[PDB]
Amino acid sequence: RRELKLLLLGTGESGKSTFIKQMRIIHGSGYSDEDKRGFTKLVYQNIFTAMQAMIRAMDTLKIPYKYEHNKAHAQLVREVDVEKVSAFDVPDYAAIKSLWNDPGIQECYDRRREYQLSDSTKYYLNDLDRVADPSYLPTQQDVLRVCVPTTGIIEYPFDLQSVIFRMVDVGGQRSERRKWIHCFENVTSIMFLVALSEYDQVLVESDNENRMEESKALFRTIITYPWFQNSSVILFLNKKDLLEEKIMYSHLVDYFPEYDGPQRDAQAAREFILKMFVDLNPDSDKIIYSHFTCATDTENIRFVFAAVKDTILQLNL
Amino acid sequence: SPEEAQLWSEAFDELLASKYGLAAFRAFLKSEFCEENIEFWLACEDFKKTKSPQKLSSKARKIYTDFIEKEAPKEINIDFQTKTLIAQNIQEATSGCFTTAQKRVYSLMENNSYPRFLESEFYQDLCK
Ligand SMILES: Nc1nc2c(ncn2[C@@H]2O[C@H](COP(=O)(O)OP(=O)(O)O)[C@@H](O)[C@H]2O)c(=O)[nH]1
Ligand code: ALF
Ligand SMILES: [Mg+2]
């Protein structure tokens, strides 16, 4: 029992619980054929919760539905309780089927930056047929895409060959940041995560406020904490595969006007992103490790964590 | 007994139904500092059955300041949209003001805390 405590940190939905699950895959318990069935209920609710949100936007932004009977279908969807869901109806399938292909709702999804929408929404809704199949088993890729918030703090222990890494899963909202206090004891590493996609979005806990300016200032304060100067800080610029989607239309120059680099480059933009985060360090003697990651990609995760496993073991041993 | 307990695995309402178990799951939610959500629901379960307008406008200010208000002691984890919603109804409060987040918070436990409780060792050693 050689133990080292690690901390997974980041602003609301930078992809923390996704790592916890990824670690359970590569070096952990694994997700067998039976266990995948437990998720089913949520995957549904996620699509419901994914959809419900887009209906409120039709009220909010004032975008009109093209086919007027789609309003009655969305009205049926509005009144379905997200909690009590257990099996998937054909009508609710058709209700969801219909509205997704509605071009007004497709226009409502173009502007998902203007309100709250789980980014795994386009993942679930283009393969509805597979899901709405009564004998549907969720793949391993489907479980990663699930949108299940983490409230409070959690210890998920994993035993690697040479060492037992104790990871700390935590809640990434301002409301849950008061709790983080109870685990800062005995720390060897922080794994700070930042959603590369969330550069144009606004936070969940408030209005008219940019998420990366949240992630920047938050990151900044974690460093400054003096019980962490004898602990290795690792940055993780997550959701890089979404950044490639996002960068193509939304311009980073409309949000961080300093950027001298070129628009429409998934690389050139992210190489400036890491510079803003790594420009927030007071301590010159302390060094900042950084990896780019696609948290829902198990092969990309297995190379970053192996290179990081070697990074940490060389430090404290 | 070890059967009353094994009955709770079935669904999340079976765990709420028993009295002993309601104190232990709290003792576990405490052990993951996410008890503010369980106490809130029972604040809503006692709120939903409240009758007189006097008790409806005063109890409504107890729970808000606790779980909702910005930098509230037991601030449950929820959005700004549901917090804006419940911020306009408290004046002339009614049984179905909070339910917006009550159901969110129940979902927050069924999909996160409760499953972990069934994998917990304190639960499983109770099941023999
Ligand atoms: N496309 C993409 N989606 C991701 C990635 N990481 C996480 N997600 C999704 O974003 C959501 C948030 O993940 P989570 O780990 O809960 O972040 P947390 O809220 O900070 O714990 C989940 O629904 C994931 O499916 C990524 O690298 N790429
Ligand atoms: F935003 Al989180 F776990 F940090 F859902
Ligand atoms: Mg999480």
Side-chain angles (χ1 to χ4, degrees):
Chain A
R1 37 158 136 177
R2 165 61 179 173
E3 169 188 317
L4 297 175
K5 200 183 208 163
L6 310 188
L7 313 185
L8 295 164
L9 316 186
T11 60
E13 292 142 304
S14 26
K16 295 189 296 304
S17 291
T18 299
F19 270 64
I20 281 299
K21 297 166 196 173
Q22 274 287 4
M23 302 315 90
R24 184 156 160 178
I25 288 168
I26 306 182
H27 300 97
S29 308
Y31 291 102
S32 75
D33 284 80
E34 179 273 306
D35 288 305
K36 291 176 197 183
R37 296 160 173 167
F39 272 96
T40 315
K41 190 163 172 175
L42 290 62
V43 174
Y44 299 144
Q45 290 181 27
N46 223 342
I47 298 155
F48 276 79
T49 306
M51 194 53 60
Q52 279 186 326
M54 267 173 288
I55 299 171
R56 332 190 179 176
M58 307 305 291
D59 279 31
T60 311
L61 306 180
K62 310 192 180 179
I63 304 179
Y65 296 91
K66 187 175 171 183
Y67 307 112
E68 206 165 38
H69 295 187
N70 257 312
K71 293 172 172 172
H73 281 220
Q75 203 86 294
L76 190 75
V77 177
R78 260 205 159 93
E79 313 153 331
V80 182
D81 301 302
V82 191
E83 76 181 34
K84 300 202 173 197
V85 171
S86 87
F88 191 10
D89 296 332
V90 178
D92 287 323
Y93 146 64
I96 291 165
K97 176 62 172 188
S98 171
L99 292 157
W100 173 240
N101 301 268
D102 205 332
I105 283 289
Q106 295 269 312
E107 180 56 57
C108 177
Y109 183 77
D110 285 323
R111 309 157 73 178
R112 77 179 152 287
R113 41 99 56 177
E114 303 187 24
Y115 60 90
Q116 300 315 309
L117 190 72
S118 180
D119 291 81
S120 304
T121 288
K122 182 163 195 188
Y123 173 84
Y124 285 122
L125 293 163
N126 272 347
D127 293 306
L128 214 175
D129 291 278
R130 187 169 58 89
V131 184
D133 198 277
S135 57
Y136 155 74
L137 173 63
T139 73
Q140 208 173 228
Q141 176 48 231
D142 298 295
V143 173
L144 290 163
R145 294 279 191 163
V146 306
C147 197
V148 179
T150 316
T151 185
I153 297 170
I154 305 84
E155 288 188 343
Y156 277 114
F158 305 103
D159 178 285
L160 277 65
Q161 184 173 13
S162 57
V163 63
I164 297 169
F165 286 123
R166 175 142 265 166
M167 301 289 291
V168 185
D169 197 9
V170 299
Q173 286 63 32
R174 270 178 181 167
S175 41
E176 301 288 297
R177 287 171 203 184
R178 65 177 200 76
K179 304 173 172 190
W180 290 15
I181 182 60
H182 302 88
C183 70
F184 293 163
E185 304 154 314
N186 206 230
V187 183
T188 296
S189 164
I190 290 169
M191 297 171 62
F192 204 95
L193 283 58
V194 185
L196 284 173
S197 66
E198 80 194 7
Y199 67 87
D200 49 348
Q201 292 179 320
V202 290
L203 272 174
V204 183
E205 305 92 279
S206 174
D207 280 8
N208 284 15
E209 280 177 311
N210 211 235
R211 278 219 194 169
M212 186 145 288
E213 289 150 22
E214 176 83 337
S215 295
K216 278 182 75 175
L218 175 61
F219 179 67
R220 134 142 281 161
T221 313
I222 300 310
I223 289 166
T224 288
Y225 299 163
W227 51 87
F228 289 149
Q229 293 296 316
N230 297 123
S231 301
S232 35
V233 185
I234 303 169
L235 174 52
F236 291 98
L237 292 184
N238 193 34
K239 292 165 177 166
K240 67 181 196 177
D241 58 304
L242 299 181
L243 171 53
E244 299 225 40
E245 290 185 327
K246 198 87 88 183
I247 190 55
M248 303 276 169
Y249 35 89
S250 183
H251 308 303
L252 192 65
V253 188
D254 292 324
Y255 307 95
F256 294 87
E258 316 306 329
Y259 186 53
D260 260 307
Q263 298 172 37
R264 275 174 268 269
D265 194 354
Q267 202 177 347
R270 89 187 182 186
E271 301 287 328
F272 165 70
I273 284 175
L274 184 55
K275 197 176 192 177
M276 284 197 291
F277 273 79
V278 182
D279 266 320
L280 298 175
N281 179 27
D283 196 343
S284 287
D285 292 353
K286 190 165 179 192
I287 299 175
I288 296 169
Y289 305 119
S290 59
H291 288 282
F292 306 94
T293 49
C294 173
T296 45
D297 190 305
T298 307
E299 281 123 338
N300 178 224
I301 283 288
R302 199 171 310 189
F303 195 89
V304 176
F305 190 68
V308 171
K309 167 186 178 169
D310 293 325
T311 310
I312 296 199
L313 281 177
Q314 198 164 310
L315 191 75
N316 208 235
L317 285 171
Chain B
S1 74
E3 257 174 3
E4 285 188 326
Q6 269 185 28
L7 185 64
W8 312 329
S9 283
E10 189 168 310
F12 193 34
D13 283 291
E14 290 296 313
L15 185 56
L16 285 166
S18 202
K19 307 132 192 185
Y20 181 92
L22 205 53
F25 187 67
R26 198 147 165 178
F28 179 83
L29 283 165
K30 288 195 79 178
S31 78
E32 300 199 338
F33 305 103
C34 47
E35 73 203 289
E36 83 271 355
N37 299 341
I38 184 58
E39 297 168 4
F40 167 60
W41 188 76
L42 288 164
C44 269
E45 265 268 325
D46 192 62
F47 169 78
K48 231 154 165 168
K49 289 177 274 189
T50 306
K51 304 175 191 171
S52 48
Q54 246 166 25
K55 293 206 180 183
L56 211 60
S57 174
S58 59
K59 283 188 187 175
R61 223 154 195 185
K62 176 184 183 185
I63 301 185
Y64 169 85
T65 318
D66 286 21
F67 302 102
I68 301 191
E69 192 184 21
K70 291 198 183 179
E71 309 297 341
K74 305 168 188 160
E75 189 187 354
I76 60 176
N77 191 13
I78 62 176
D79 326 46
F80 178 67
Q81 205 157 23
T82 301
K83 287 181 195 175
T84 304
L85 183 75
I86 302 178
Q88 322 287 357
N89 261 17
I90 293 189
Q91 218 67 38
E92 300 191 51
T94 52
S95 305
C97 170
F98 294 112
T99 43
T100 314
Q102 181 192 11
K103 292 184 180 180
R104 162 156 315 289
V105 171
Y106 187 91
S107 283
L108 198 54
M109 288 190 298
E110 188 178 43
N111 307 331
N112 218 225
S113 308
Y114 167 60
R116 262 189 317 291
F117 178 79
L118 299 180
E119 297 197 47
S120 77
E121 295 212 272
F122 171 47
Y123 161 77
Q124 292 171 315
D125 273 346
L126 236 51
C127 312
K128 64 190 193 175

